[PDB]
Every structure is written in structure tokens, then in C-alpha cells.
Design a protein around this nucleic acid. Sequence first.
RNA 1: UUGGCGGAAAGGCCUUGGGUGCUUGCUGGCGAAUUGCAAUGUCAUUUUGCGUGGGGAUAAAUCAUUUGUAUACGACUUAGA
RNA 2: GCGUUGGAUUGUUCACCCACUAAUAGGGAACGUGAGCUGGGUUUAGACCGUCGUGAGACAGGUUAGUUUUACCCUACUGAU
RNA 3: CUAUCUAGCGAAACCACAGCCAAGGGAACGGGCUUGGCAGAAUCAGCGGGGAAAGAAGACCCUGUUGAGCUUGACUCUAGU
RNA 4: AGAACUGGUACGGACAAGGGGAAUCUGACUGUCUAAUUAAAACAUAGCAUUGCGAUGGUCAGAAAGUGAUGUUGACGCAAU
RNA 5: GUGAACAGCCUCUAGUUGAUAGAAUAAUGUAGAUAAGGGAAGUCGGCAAAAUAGAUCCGUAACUUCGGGAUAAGGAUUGGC
RNA 6: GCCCUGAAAAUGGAUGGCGCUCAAGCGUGUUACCUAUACUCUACCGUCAGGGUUGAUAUGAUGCCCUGACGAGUAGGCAGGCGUGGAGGUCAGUGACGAAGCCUAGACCGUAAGGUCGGGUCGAACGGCCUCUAGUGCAGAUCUUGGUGGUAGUAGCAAAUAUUCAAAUGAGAACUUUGAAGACUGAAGUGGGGAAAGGUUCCACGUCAACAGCAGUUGGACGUGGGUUAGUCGAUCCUAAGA
RNA 7: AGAACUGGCGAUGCGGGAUGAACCGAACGUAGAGUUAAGGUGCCGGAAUACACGCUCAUCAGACACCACAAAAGGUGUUAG
RNA 8: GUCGAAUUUGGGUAUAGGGGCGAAAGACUAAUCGAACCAUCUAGUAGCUGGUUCCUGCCGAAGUUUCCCUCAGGAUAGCAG
RNA 9: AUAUUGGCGAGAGACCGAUAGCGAACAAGUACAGUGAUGGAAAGAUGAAAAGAACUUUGAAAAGAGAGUGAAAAAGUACGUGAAAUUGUUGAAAGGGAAGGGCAUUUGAUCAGACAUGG
Lengths: 386, 155
Amino acid sequence: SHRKYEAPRHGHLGFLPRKRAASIRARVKAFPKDDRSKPVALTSFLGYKAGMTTIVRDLDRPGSKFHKREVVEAVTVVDTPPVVVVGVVGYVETPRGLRSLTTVWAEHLSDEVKRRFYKNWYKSKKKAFTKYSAKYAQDGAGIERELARIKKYASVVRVLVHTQIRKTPLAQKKAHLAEIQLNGGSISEKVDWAREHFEKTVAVDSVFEQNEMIDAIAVTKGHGFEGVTHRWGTKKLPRKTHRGLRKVACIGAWHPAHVMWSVARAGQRGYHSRTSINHKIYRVGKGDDEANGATSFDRTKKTITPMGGFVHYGEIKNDFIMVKGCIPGNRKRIVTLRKSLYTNTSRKALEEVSLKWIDTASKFGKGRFQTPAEKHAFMGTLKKDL
Amino acid sequence: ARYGATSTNPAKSASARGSYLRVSFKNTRETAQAINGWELTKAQKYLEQVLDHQRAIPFRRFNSSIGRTAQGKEFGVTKARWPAKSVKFVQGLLQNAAANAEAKGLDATKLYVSHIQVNQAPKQRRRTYRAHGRINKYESSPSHIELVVTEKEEA
RNA sequence: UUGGCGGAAAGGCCUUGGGUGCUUGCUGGCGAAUUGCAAUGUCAUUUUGCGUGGGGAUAAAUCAUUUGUAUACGACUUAGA
RNA sequence: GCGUUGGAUUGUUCACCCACUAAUAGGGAACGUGAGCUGGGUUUAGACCGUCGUGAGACAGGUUAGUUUUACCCUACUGAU
RNA sequence: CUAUCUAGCGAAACCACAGCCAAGGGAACGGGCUUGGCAGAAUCAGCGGGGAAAGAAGACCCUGUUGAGCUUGACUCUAGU
RNA sequence: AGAACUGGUACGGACAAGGGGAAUCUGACUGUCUAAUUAAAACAUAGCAUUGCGAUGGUCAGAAAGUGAUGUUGACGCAAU
RNA sequence: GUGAACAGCCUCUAGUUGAUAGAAUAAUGUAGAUAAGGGAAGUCGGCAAAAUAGAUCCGUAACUUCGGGAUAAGGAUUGGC
RNA sequence: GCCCUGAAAAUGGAUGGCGCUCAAGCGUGUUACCUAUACUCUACCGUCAGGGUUGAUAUGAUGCCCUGACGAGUAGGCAGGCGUGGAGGUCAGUGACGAAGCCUAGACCGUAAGGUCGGGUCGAACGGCCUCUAGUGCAGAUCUUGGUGGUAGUAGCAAAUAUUCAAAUGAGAACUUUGAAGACUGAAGUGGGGAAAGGUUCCACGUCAACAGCAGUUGGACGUGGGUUAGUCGAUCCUAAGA
RNA sequence: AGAACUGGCGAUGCGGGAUGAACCGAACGUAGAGUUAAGGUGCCGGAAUACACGCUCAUCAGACACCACAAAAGGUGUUAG
RNA sequence: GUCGAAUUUGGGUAUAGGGGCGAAAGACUAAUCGAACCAUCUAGUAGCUGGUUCCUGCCGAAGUUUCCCUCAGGAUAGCAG
RNA sequence: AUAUUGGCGAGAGACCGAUAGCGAACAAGUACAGUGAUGGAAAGAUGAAAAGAACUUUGAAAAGAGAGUGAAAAAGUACGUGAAAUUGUUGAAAGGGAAGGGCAUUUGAUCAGACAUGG
Ligand SMILES: [Mg+2]
């Protein structure tokens, strides 16, 4: 009645309500400011988070105790095969908000995506875009018209792309489909680029580059129904308390005579949407490269995949993004990697990294070896073999 | 004789009853309504499946605190269950009726359940013992069930 | 029917060319009553079930089963010809 | 807008010292907050003392020991169909 | 091990009528009244803000020409001696 | 009781099974009581002291009695504090 | 059998296998465990927990009613062959 | 004078609200307009008052008729009435060709208490009028007795280590019986007997409506029977505190 | 808290004062027509966004008796004296 | 906590309600104790609390005086029928 | 000549009518409670007559459906009538944090009052 001692409230009221996300694919809610002066290009990319490993590198940061010295950092690797372009959607400005006027799709869609439109594929007749396809029959018009409508009206333009989830260890056959804003220049140029890419493929190395700071958008890992203590970091009550002690003791004063939206309560924890910013690209992997995991210092032939394989994920056989630190969501989960809404100049953000070594030991226990070759060298001959 | 309100041709109809039956009034109400106006064999088939836990009985009135099932979806509902003892007694009555119909030579294939009504038998009273030397009632809520099958009229 | 224009919610607008009805611009030939001195006397547009003749098109979702990136139960996310 | 603390003695609020700190402001919400806790103090019944009283007893004096009940309903609030 | 979900089984408390707020005035702290905010079926798990929730015609206090246990050179007596 | 040998230095291998020390308040001790909120420092106690009584008596019982307890007693006793 | 043992733990004879059941494994509980570094800073108060513990051999203060204090304290040891 | 400073409190919020700035603000003036159960005029109900009229002439003289005025009400007083059990009198009352009673968003009378009728259901008695009589009218009394709800298919049915496979039987088997397995009580027993107490619970056959807070084919349950054998084990005899 | 006279509330609805025992108006059989009271007439809402002369601009204007408060003191704001 | 004695305990027996029994707590004396249980006196008394049953019509209050162990009550006068 | 809430035998009532009247209209001072003294209920009604449902069919059975009896089963040993609370089913309607009420009228449903003039 004036709280005896003062403390900060538990938890952030800007991340309410703490409910399950609508979709498991978190929504890109903002794309970068468009600079229509530069080449048409994608502003985000879709991938699957595969696991984390460890890096070594010299730091470059004059004035730091750790300048010109080796530091060792957690990284996370996200499996990033090429994305296929299959549509363009045009948006108009209105006094009520951005609104979509049409979507024009590609003549041919793969099963991977088509499957996204069904709940019972095994037994459907797979009629998905079968009448739409015929719009291509006519030398162009129906399609060519709608393209023209987007050129004429339309204020922002997004492509529709999907993951090639089959190029990935996942059991799931259904691919993930998303709109991604086209930021390169000019509405007309945008739709042509889009037209030209229909059914074609786009790789990450045409979106993102080493040292870039990028944002990650993903639904957070679920945890089911949580109590107040772990959900909000409320303080345990004393051992002595009757009727349990993972609670908050006082849910409210007498007036307002209503439990209030700001007190902590049990309920869902996890499976929330997070846009996490400022994650520096430390590697852009090529899938064709059998030295993915190597360095100009660690010259050995090895791929990024850990001995044993990424736990609970499998192998990395495609292009990949390696990002410093960590990212929301869990292994297997779809992630959108978005580019920065701003021009960071951090010095931390401008630093150019070069890896020196990338861990590759088994993450399935205290792994002591990077490559099968190294293991055999150390152990010598066993009772299997030879 | 003397059932509730019926508006059915008694000549095209057959009927069955059971009285002072020891099943739950509330549960069996819920399941009688589940097959009301149903074609007899659909009814027959469905009740057999509710025993198998493949469909369920929607709980619509006597239902607060009852769990939720995916199986209520069919009937636009969230809260359904699988009242075995009820299903079982209603089956007996359906079976009887069906027998009575054959005896009247009604067409088994035209038969639908045109009337089905559970109401409440007199209670059966037992005792529960409670803390601090008290006694409380531990009772049964038995059911009277009546139903009627009728031939659907043609075009 | 010839062109065009309209995306803010355009779903409407302007246009070219004939055809067809009407034309109170003007001059004629008929008709109206008894609905009885007012009272009930012009038909509007919505749905929705049926009826005919033409053009058309020829799926899925749910339960059950299954995954565990999800989960108290529902719900979520996967897989199955 | 945002913070406003860690301790020694006391049931204490208060008070008082130590100590850190950007700062250790003051107040309200049934002197917020007991089906949220605790039960140290107060204030039942045991008991010792001092004062008072012939006594039974008394004390706004000291001291010790003294059972903390119910939510499954409505609403609110958290989450879920 | 519970809670949870299922089959069987199946109580109790409590209940004027009920159940979303802000302010106003008002028996001087409204669910109802007045003025405004508002306001969409049916629901599940939790929760302890509110229902000045619920449990014994208030333990404290006062009133009553209402008591009882107890004490004494109060009043009036009495076994005994 | 002793000695050698032996092991990932372990061996009262589970089970079983005292934490210790320095003090102050308080009651000597063991014992006792508020069955269901008080086990205590309260009651008891041994020890100490005081009081009454030699039986036609002290203390106590009964309405009364040819009535009763102490008393199957006698001051190293009974009774009362 | 172990062992000091009518302890605890395992067994034979005899007797039971009876105290609704199925599927899950959220919160919150009830009961059982563990925690890096710090070590009572928590609290009215070390409440609750933890630590000690068997045996053999060594060793053992003040004080004292000379009986005690005393398992004081503090140490080494412990299997198998 | 208006306006400005002086002018600090706790949920968000009040010139009643919206909103209003040559006002929809402040002072003043002038007209029109809105509206009470009040005022004016009229109908009707009642109350009170005054007046007329059975003079011979059908049906109410506590009546009929004329006239004026008036109407708030707790506690409370009075009046006129409505309705119930029974009683005297009377309608030579209604009725098994249907009394009484009950049901009925059917009808009619009355300001009202109430009365009356139709339809349905029912089955043996009942009513009007003048009187007489009271154990005579309910919403309440933490009223009495009974019956019923919401609560709710909810709280729950979690102590005592633990169950599993098969066959048999049966309408039916998680729960019965038999077999096998896994376990427990661990002789300080979940073993074998007794004392008090119960009183047939013992045993057999049959057997499940109720009871065993799931079940039941099982039982300490239900039905029908059977069963307790003494000179030597007790009582019985003895004495104890005491009666 | 306590007196004086009267009028009220209590025992009393109605119209106004948003609301409201007691203020303003006005007291009450069942109704029709008219007219008013106190109070109002931008819109909520029945009734002139009527007429007339001024005054007022507030980065805290002001807006109607009882009544839901404001003062000392200041202003080269603007008005009239 | 105690655990070989002021030990624990069966049955028998004795003590009965202003009585018992009490290593004393107003404890215990059949879920009863600062006076048990049962029935009757008893429909105990209550200036106090609660309730008090059909309709309409007319009239219509008092909270003041005096006196009272009077101050939550009466009598008296007033107001009313 | 007077008394008489007891006992025996009788005649009565402006008494009560099964929550009334005695506590008891009944296997009532019973069943049940309490160590004991004591405390002490609930509970009447098928039909004139059991004619108490032969027989058939479904079911493990209880029962159901038919049939049959009966003046009636809208009397089935749950039994005369069979209210209310409360409930199932059917039909109609309404429903943005209660419902219900007043004056008024729309709309739907339902019910009336007429009654007679020559053919
Ligand atoms: Mg004034």
C-alpha cells in the first residue's frame, strides 16, 4: 500500500498475449525500405534450421583486450537449398492499407508445392492448378493481362517462392510457400524479373553475403502449459507455503476488483513468433563444395556436417547460411532469414570475418574427432577392419 | 401402452419400452437423441461404432465438464463421449422394436426411429459415509426408455 | 455494335455505327360512364424452395490411422492409393 | 519515461548504525494484498514475577507455552477449443 | 501418486433475483438506479482480484430492573459447634 | 592377536547408526497434568519446618442411630498446612 | 542367513496377491531425491533440511555433591585372500 | 468587468453526455415555442350534503328521482363486501344420461376479494338464498412436515510395493474357478489358537432383485437345509477386595 | 451537538433539479380536449442552430439557486470608468 | 519423550452430582463438566428479537406535556376514529 | 344426597377426517436409538368381483410388443382421483453482459357479438 521495496516487473508486456502462434511459419511483418535504384532482388529467404556448432576466428576490433586474438563462438547452421519462384502478387495502396489485386502463377508447379494445397494428398485427385495451367494455352492473354494489371496499378510487388524441401533430410514432403518482397528497382522491372523466374530457381548467395547482418523470423520452441515461475520468472515462494509455491502470492489488490492483465498467470509457454535481429553471416555454404567445413587455415577436406550427422536433423547436402550466435525456433523448423531493415554501422556490424576452424566433432556426446580419418590415425587398428 | 406424444401412423409403426432400468438418465438421454429420427440401420450401425470408439455421442445438455473429442466434429460439437451402458440398453430396445415390426410384417428396410424418449425413473438410494461422522446420499438415477420405429412414406 | 477511359471500394464512364419501339414539335378520327359523393385501386427488391431449355464443370474436408518441430483435453504439425 | 538496494539490533511500522550506489524520494489502491502465506506481536483458556487488593481477582507492566477451515459455482484474469 | 482425458459410480456447501465496467448521487465504498464505456452462440484447463463469498442470532463493547462460577466484616439466613 | 599377498585407496560398501562446543534464565533429579489448540519454568517429590491429638482424643462422615473413616491404628503414630 | 540382537534387510513352512479400472504425463500440488560458487547473507528464530553415527585402538578440558562431567573434545583403523 | 497567475493525490471519466469559441460561453433585453397526476370545460365511478316522491293507481321505500360539492396516505379507527369447515330453514335445487376434484397464453361478469361458462380428465356425491356457528383465508416467522431443483454427470472413487498369460464356466468374465508366471506378509506374520464381544456370520446345495460407493457367474449377501456328542476341558466347589 | 417560529420529510406519488427522503413546481378517483407551473427549446430530447447590444480566447477557458468549494496577492491581456 | 519401574495392562471391586475423583489442568466423572445424564414442575418469565393469512370505501396520527429505580418500558394529557 | 382424565357395560356430539384426530385408523408403545433411566416414528384407499393378464412373439432375465380380462387398464397387487415444484419428447417463438414489468401500437395466432326479408 506502497509496495515495501521496489523491483522491476517480471516479463515484457510487449510480447503478449503469450499464446500459440497462428501458423508454425512465422510471418515476415516488415520488408526493408525499397531502393528502386538497384537490381531487382529478393529481400528474404526460407530455410530449415539444422543445428549449431563452434567456430574459431581472430577478432578485428582495435581497442579491445581481444583484438588480433582468437575468440571462439557458437554458430548456427541453417539448411538452405534454392527456392523456386512460382508466382507474383501485386499490391495497391489504399486509404485502408496495402491490398492485393491479383496473383499470377506459373504454368507448372511441382508436387512439393501442390501438396501444400491439400490436407489428404494420398487420396486426392491432385486437380490443384489444372485449370489455371490452361490459361497458358492462349498465346498469352489471360496471364499476359494480369501481369499488365500489376504493372499499371501496384505499388509494391512480391514473388511467391517455395522451399525444395525434398533436398533436405526431413520426412515432411509438403514444401513451404511464402511471399517475399522484390526490392530491386521499378514496378515494371519487378514483374519482368518475376515473369522470367517463373519455375526457375533462386539461391541464397544471390540474396545474402559474408559479414551481412540479417534478421531471423521463426516460431519459437513449444513447451506446453507452464506455471507462473518458469513462464514469467516470478520468485519461488518459501518452502513453508501451504498449497504450493510456484505461484505469485498476490494476484491483485482489492480494487480494481478484477485480476488485471498485467499480473503473471499460468499458461502456454513457447510456440511464439519472434523476429530476432542482427545476426551476422559467418559463412555462405555451397552444397556442391566438398570442403564446406574447411578454411584457409584448416585445409582438410570436410563438409559442414558433424560426425554422426546433425543430431535430430541429418546431413547438409545443400547451400547453407551460417549465422553467428543463435536463432529462434528449433531443429527442423522453417525459418525466414530476412535482410536488415536498417543500415547498421556498429563496427561490430562492419567487421569482416574469416573463420579459421569449424567444429565438426560429433554433437551426440563428447565427440573427440573431426573426421573419420583423424579417428583412425589416433586409435590405430581395431578388431573390425582389415 | 400410453407413450409420449407421437404423430406417426400407428399402422405403419412398431414400438418398444423398458422401465426402471439401471442406467444413467442423463447419459442415456444424450444417446437417445443421438439417433432420433435416424433410419434404423444407420442407428444400429452407428451405435455399434460408438461402442468401438470410432464415432461418438454428442453430449448437448447434460454435459458440463465432460472432455473434448475430435469425434464431436461430425456433429458440430466439441464435447462428446462413449456411453457404453446407455448404448447397450438402447440397442436392446431397438432390437425388440425391430422384432415387433417383423411380427407386424412392416418393411425392415423402410424403418426409421420416429420416437425415442428417456425420462426419469424413481431413484434408488444407497448411503455414503462422510467426514466427521456424517452420512450422505449415494443414489441411482435410473431410466424409463420408450421408442418407436415407423415405415418412411414414399413419394 | 466501333473505339477508348476508370483499381480508393475501379464494377462504372465516355464514344462510333446502324436496327427497333415511342415521340406531347404540329393537324385529325375513336375510346373512357354504373368502380355509383372518399375508404383497399401504380409495383418496388430481397432472399428461398421448387418448373422447363441451353451452355458448363466432374472435388474435398472430417473421423479413424500416423509424426513429435505440438500438446492437460480439444488444438497444432507431419505421413499414408 | 525509468530506477530507488545489501545488512546488524527490534514482532515491530518507526527508530538506529554498517555498507554499497546514479539515487538509496514521499505516498495511495478497505491504514492494497491471510479461501495468497507467515504467526513473531496483540487479545481466550496453562504458568512465573513485580505493583495493587482482606480476598476472588486486576494491571493500557515484564515473562513462557499456546489448532490459521472451504472454491468444483459467477465474474475478472491467464491461457485453450 | 494426483490433477488431466475415458467406462462404470456419484455426493456436499451454498442459492432474494442475478452476474462487464467508469463516474455520480445514495444508509456517506452499486450487479441493478442516473450519465457514459460498451455489447455476439456454445465452451475447456487453470486462478485466487471481487461476489463487503461460505461456515453457529458477535468472542470485544454497551443496554436489560437477564444469569451463573467464584470472593468477602455486602444484605438475609443456615448444618455444626 | 599378528604377518604376507591383492584392488580405479575401496571395505560399519545395502541395512543399521550420537553432530559438537561456550554460556545466561529457569526447575535439583526420575516422575505428573489440561483425552480434542498450552508438557512448561505449572503439579509431585525426597529434604526442611510449623500445627493439632494420650482414645471420655485429634481430623473427617451421617437425617438419625446399639451408625462410620483413620483403626488389624497409638506420638519412630494419625491428622492438618 | 546376515548381525550385538525378538532391529533392519533377504528366505522356508503356512497364508495372501484384497482394497475400480484404461490412456496420457500440462500447470499447481502431496511424498521421495540432487544441485556449480558462496555458506544463514534467508527467518521472530537454522523452522525445514543437511552433516555425525557401528566396532577396534589411541586420546580426552573446566567444573564437581568425588558418584560424575565422558561416546567430552580430537584422532587412526575397518574388504578380499 | 471578462480573461491569465496564485491552483499539488492517488483505477480511466465527466458543465448529465456529445460537442460548442461574433457560442451551444458570460451580463442584459424582447418575442415565440415545449411540457405535470396542477388549472379550465365535459363523460363516468364513489363519498358526503341538500331536496323531491308509494295520494288511490305491478316488478326493489334500507328504494326511485333532482341538485351541488368533494377524492393523497403509514400507524391506526370505522364501514360495505369477497371466500372456507360445520349447523337450522328453504329451493319437492344439481347428479352415474356423470356429483366433487383437477388441467386449459378458450369465453363472460365484477374496481377488487371473486363469480360464471365451455372443452378435457374423472367417478359419488354436491350447490344457491335467509339464517347459525368457528380450530375460517399465508409469501415470509434461520416457521413445521413432506416433496423437488440449480449446483453436476461435478468433487471425487490416488495410504497399506503388483500384477501377467491361458483354459474352464457362464447370456455376459479386468474382478469366479483351475493351471502357469511374477510378487508380498517374513514367525514381533498377511501363520496357528483363544479371552471379552457377536450370535449362526461355520458347512452344503441353489443362487443375484437389493447390498459389497467399478463389476460380479463371487460373498460375512439372498433362499433352502445341515451342524456343536465329555466322570477326566470349563462352569459347578472355595475363598479375595467387597456384596 | 443543542434550542426558537413556521413550513416540510417521516406517512407522498406526480412535473423539474441527469442522479437524489427533505430544494423548485405542484399534492393524486377513471378518462377526453385545452392551458400552464417550476424547468427548458444545437443533437442526445418535446420545443427558435430565434431576435438584440456588449463582453470573453484560457499550451488548465466557461457554462445556472439548494449543489457538489476556493483565498490573500499579482498581470503593460482586453474592456468601460 | 520414556523404555525395569512413582512402569504398562486385563478382569473383579469401591466411590454418584454442590456429589465423587484430582502428583491440581477447574481436570476427569460414557464425543457431556466453572456442577453429568434422564423425566417432570413447564406452554417457566421476557420492558427484547422474529412473524402475524381476503378486497374495496371513508376518516386519519405521533415522536410532545407531567409522573415513574423513568432513559429500548409504562401511566397521564395531546393528536385520531 | 357428594367425588370420580382409573376399571366393566352402554347411549350420544353444530368434535377431527390420515401432516387432522390419542404417540398409535395398519403385525404401535411396534421398528429404531440409548450402558441406563428413557426417547420413540413412518405407515389407510386396484376392482362389484382377481376376472391378478391363458396363449404368440423378442429377450440370458427383468421385461417389451401383441392377445386376453374388465364398465374402465386414462384402474396392472408401482394400483381411486392424481395438483405444484421439478423433468423428457413434440410444436411455436424470442434471445449482441440477466430475466420479469408498465402505457401504446405493428405483425402472427386465437376468440367473439350479431339475426333477419320479400323468393
Ligand atoms: Mg449564489
